[PDB]
Amino acid sequence: NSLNDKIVTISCKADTNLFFYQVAGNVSLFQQTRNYLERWRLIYDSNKAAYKIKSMDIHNTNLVLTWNAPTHNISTQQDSNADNQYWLLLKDIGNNSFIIASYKNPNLVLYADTVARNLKLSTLNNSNYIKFIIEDYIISDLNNFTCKISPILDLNKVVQQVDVTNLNVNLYTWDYGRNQKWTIRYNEEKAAYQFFNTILSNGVLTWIFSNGNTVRVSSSNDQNNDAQYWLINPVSDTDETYTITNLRDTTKALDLYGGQTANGTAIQVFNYHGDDNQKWNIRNPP
Amino acid sequence: NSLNDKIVTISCKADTNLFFYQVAGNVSLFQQTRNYLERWRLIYDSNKAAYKIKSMDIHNTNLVLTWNAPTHNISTQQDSNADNQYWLLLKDIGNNSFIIASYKNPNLVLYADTVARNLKLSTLNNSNYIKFIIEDYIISDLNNFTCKISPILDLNKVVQQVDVTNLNVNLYTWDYGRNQKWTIRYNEEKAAYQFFNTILSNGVLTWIFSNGNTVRVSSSNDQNNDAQYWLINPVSDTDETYTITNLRDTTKALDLYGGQTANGTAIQVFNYHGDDNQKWNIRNPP
Amino acid sequence: VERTFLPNGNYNIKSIFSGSLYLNPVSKSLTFSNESSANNQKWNVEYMAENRCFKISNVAEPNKYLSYDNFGFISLDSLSNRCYWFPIKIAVNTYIMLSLNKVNELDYAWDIYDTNENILSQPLLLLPNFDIYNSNQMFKLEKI
Ligand SMILES: OC[C@H]1O[C@@H](O[C@H]2[C@H](O)[C@@H](O)[C@H](O)O[C@@H]2CO)[C@H](O)[C@@H](O)[C@H]1O
Numbered sequence: 001n002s003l004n005d006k007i008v009t010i011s012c013k014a015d016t017n018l019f020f021y022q023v024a025g026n027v028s029l030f031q032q033t034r035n036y037l038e039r040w041r042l043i044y045d046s047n048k049a050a051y052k053i054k055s056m057d058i059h060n061t062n063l064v065l066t067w068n069a070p071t072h073n074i075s076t077q078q079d080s081n082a083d084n085q086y087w088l089l090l091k092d093i094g095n096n097s098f099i100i101a102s103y104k105n106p107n108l109v110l111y112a113d114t115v116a117r118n119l120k121l122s123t124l125n126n127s128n129y130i131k132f133i134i135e136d137y138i139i140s141d142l143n144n145f146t147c148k149i150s151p152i153l154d155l156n157k158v159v160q161q162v163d164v165t166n167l168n169v170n171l172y173t174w175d176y177g178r179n180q181k182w183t184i185r186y187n188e189e190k191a192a193y194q195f196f197n198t199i200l201s202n203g204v205l206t207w208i209f210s211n212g213n214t215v216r217v218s219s220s221n222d223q224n225n226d227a228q229y230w231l232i233n234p235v236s237d238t239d240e241t242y243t244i245t246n247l248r249d250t251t252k253a254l255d256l257y258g259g260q261t262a263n264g265t266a267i268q269v270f271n272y273h274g275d276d277n278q279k280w281n282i283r284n285p286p
Numbered sequence: 287n288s289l290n291d292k293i294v295t296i297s298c299k300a301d302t303n304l305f306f307y308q309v310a311g312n313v314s315l316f317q318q319t320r321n322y323l324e325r326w327r328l329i330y331d332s333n334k335a336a337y338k339i340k341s342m343d344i345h346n347t348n349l350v351l352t353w354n355a356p357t358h359n360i361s362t363q364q365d366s367n368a369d370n371q372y373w374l375l376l377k378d379i380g381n382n383s384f385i386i387a388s389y390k391n392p393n394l395v396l397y398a399d400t401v402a403r404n405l406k407l408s409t410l411n412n413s414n415y416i417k418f419i420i421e422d423y424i425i426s427d428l429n430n431f432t433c434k435i436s437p438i439l440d441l442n443k444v445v446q447q448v449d450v451t452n453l454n455v456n457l458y459t460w461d462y463g464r465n466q467k468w469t470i471r472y473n474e475e476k477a478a479y480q481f482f483n484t485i486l487s488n489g490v491l492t493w494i495f496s497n498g499n500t501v502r503v504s505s506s507n508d509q510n511n512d513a514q515y516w517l518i519n520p521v522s523d524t525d526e527t528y529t530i531t532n533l534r535d536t537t538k539a540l541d542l543y544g545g546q547t548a549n550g551t552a553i554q555v556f557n558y559h560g561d562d563n564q565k566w567n568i569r570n571p572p
Numbered sequence: 573v574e575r576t577f578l579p580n581g582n583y584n585i586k587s588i589f590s591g592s593l594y595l596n597p598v599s600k601s602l603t604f605s606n607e608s609s610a611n612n613q614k615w616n617v618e619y620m621a622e623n624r625c626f627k628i629s630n631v632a633e634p635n636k637y638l639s640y641d642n643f644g645f646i647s648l649d650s651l652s653n654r655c656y657w658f659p660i661k662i663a664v665n666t667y668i669m670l671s672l673n674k675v676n677e678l679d680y681a682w683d684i685y686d687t688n689e690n691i692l693s694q695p696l697l698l699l700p701n702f703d704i705y706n707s708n709q710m711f712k713l714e715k716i
């Protein structure tokens with residue numbers, strides 16, 4: 001009842017670059033795609049105390065992870081609420097990973113064949129092949145993600161640090177420079193993100209609260225400064241639009257000054273109102 | 287890894303009145319004792335991703351839960367860091383219970399034989415007999431505990447509600463009155479405690495901040511008031527001595543007004559200093 | 573008279589992980605131990621024509637048969653339908669031992685857990701079987 005209805009990615013503890021991937025009834029292991037092919041909704045049944053693992057496939061919407069008894073094979077099939085479609089999510093504490101056991105037959109658990117790139121059922125052992133990382137899909141897509149960030153008022157412009165020594169942050173036309181790219185990293189303890197500018201090694205986007213609403217890049221060797229961390233909240237029904245609020249004061253949102261689009265326009269924080277000048281597209285640099 | 291070095295009690299999901307109990311190397315299932323016989327330190331080995339489960343027995347300090355492989359028997363033996371003394375702690379999410387699997391053979395997990403009142407082993411299944419509640423020992427001891435609360439400046443006196451209609455709280459001499467006894471309930475959602483006066487049905491101890499340092503009893507149907515919740519922290523190297531701090535502001539500790547001792551002395555919240563008039567013995571009403 | 577691929581009589585039972593460890597009971601479990609040259613490591617295999625399976629008793633305890641309990645362990649018990657074993661021969665005297673009965677609507681087989689090929693102190697379990705390639709489910713039956 002804390003994972004219920006959550007949308008997640010599932011990857012292998014044995015090979016963290018491999019994710020559960022679904023298409024047309026087949027489940028395989030595949031590199032990160034950051035899309036619905038690797039997304040799953042966990043659906044809790046309180047009576048069984050077990051979960052269905054439903055594919056977020058956009059064409060077939062009723063597909064769930066299914067053990068093909070009596071074989072050891074796994075597939076996705078139409079949800080009929082069968083026992084071979086339910087799974088126990090057992091968290092290995094201290095290892096931050098899950099064993100996923102069949103509810104139908106808990107002697108058997110999911111096993112990742114990293115060489116065949118698929119899944120089967122197996123009895124238990126102490127290897128990482130039966131351990132899985134289950135992560136909120138936003139965190140999974142954004143963590144360690146190198147991106148450009150644009151106001152939705154002008155998707156041709158981006159948020160940039162001015163240059164290696166001018167740590168100011170403004171809006172400018174996209175020119176593929178490293179000062180215009182940010183690597184997002186998630187902090188598990190803080191449950192919040194930092195934006196590292198790629199022109200510097202340890203420079204993060206920061207609310208300079210001792211100076212009103214100013215934001216600038218500053219060194220991340222300021223250990224316990226919440227002003228350096230942000231919540232990234234998806235905007236409904238979009239794939240790449242977010243609001244970005246500050247961990248120090250979550251009423252404070254990343255804000256394009258006045259909603260102006262001119263080169264050099266200030267990026268700041270401002271009281272959250274959720275207008276279009278506080279919405280951002282986070283995208284792959286082309 | 288949030289469990290490393292934690293001292294816990296372990297009880298059965300199949301019978302929540304039965305706890306793991308240790309004496310002279312024999313492990314059994316026994317009613318709640320609220321003492322070191324049912325306390326265990328979890329010791330994480332990070333390379334194994336597994337735990338040693340060590341008894342807090344004050345007489346033999348080196349005893350850990352041990353599977354006497356290949357038999358069905360579980361006991362406590364001298365720690366020799368062996369595989370049959372390591373355990374995978376798998377938390378069943380949604381169920382809020384743990385499966386405890388042998389590191390030597392992860393196909394086998396602890397099974398509570400509640401009729402024989404001891405432990406054996408089983409392959410994994412969906413029964414409640416392999417599920418366990420692992421809880422920090424203070425919470426385990428204090429949750430649903432009906433107690434009297436005495437300052438350490440005078441154990442003969444206790445914190446009481448004045449009477450059923452006067453909801454004020456003061457110090458008075460012990461007389462076994464229901465207004466002198468408190469039932470502690472732990473709210474896992476808030477990670478804090480409430481003290482319920484047994485003369486009322488729904489009356490809890492609250493810091494009414496709108497009257498300064500005033501603490502009284504009020505309805506618990508006032509939902510979102512962190513003033514109605516408390517942190518209970520054990521005074522070091524004691525058996526039943528604690529300090530009690532309010533949730534709203536955690537430097538606000540429960541305080542015997544002035545350190546006075548006569549009947550009717552007020553009970554309040556005061557900034558923490560850890561002195562004798564902010565310490566409290568929480569005891570069984572004898 | 574012989575009715576099948578495996579003749580009636582006394583066998584030692586070994587795992588493929590070790591030529592020097594022999595199946596014997598220890599308390600109520602079954603495990604592989606050092607050669608004792610004693611009857612408790614001797615197993616009488618008898619074919620049952622009616623069910624085309626085998627029952628396997630311990631020579632030291634002739635009225636006790638290899639069976640399985642409700643906890644996943646192979647056990648030694650009085651005669652019952654849990655004592656019927658259906659071997660699949662996969663090499664010269666190497667077999668997978670299935671329970672005659674479907675368990676949890678699957679084939680279940682004898683299974684010994686190994687740690688880097690070490691099975692010392694491991695109890696013999698009954699676990700699901702899916703094919704003939706699981707090393708933990710392969711056992712030698714040596715006439716002796
Ligand atoms: O701190 C700037 C602030 O500007 C607001 O937009 C203003 C804008 O400044 C002004 O030029 C215009 O005429 O009226 C707007 C008020 O609605 C933004 O709303 C705010 O988010 C901040 O960006």
Ligand SMILES: OC[C@H]1O[C@@H](O[C@H]2[C@H](O)[C@@H](O)[C@H](O)O[C@@H]2CO)[C@H](O)[C@@H](O)[C@H]1O
Nearest residue numbers: 541542543544545546556559561563564
């Ligand atoms: O009012 C609570 C406060 O009282 C202190 O005791 C004081 C006392 O109030 C004061 O009259 C006297 O002159 O000195 C005392 C201290 O030595 C408590 O020490 C303090 O903890 C509070 O409880």
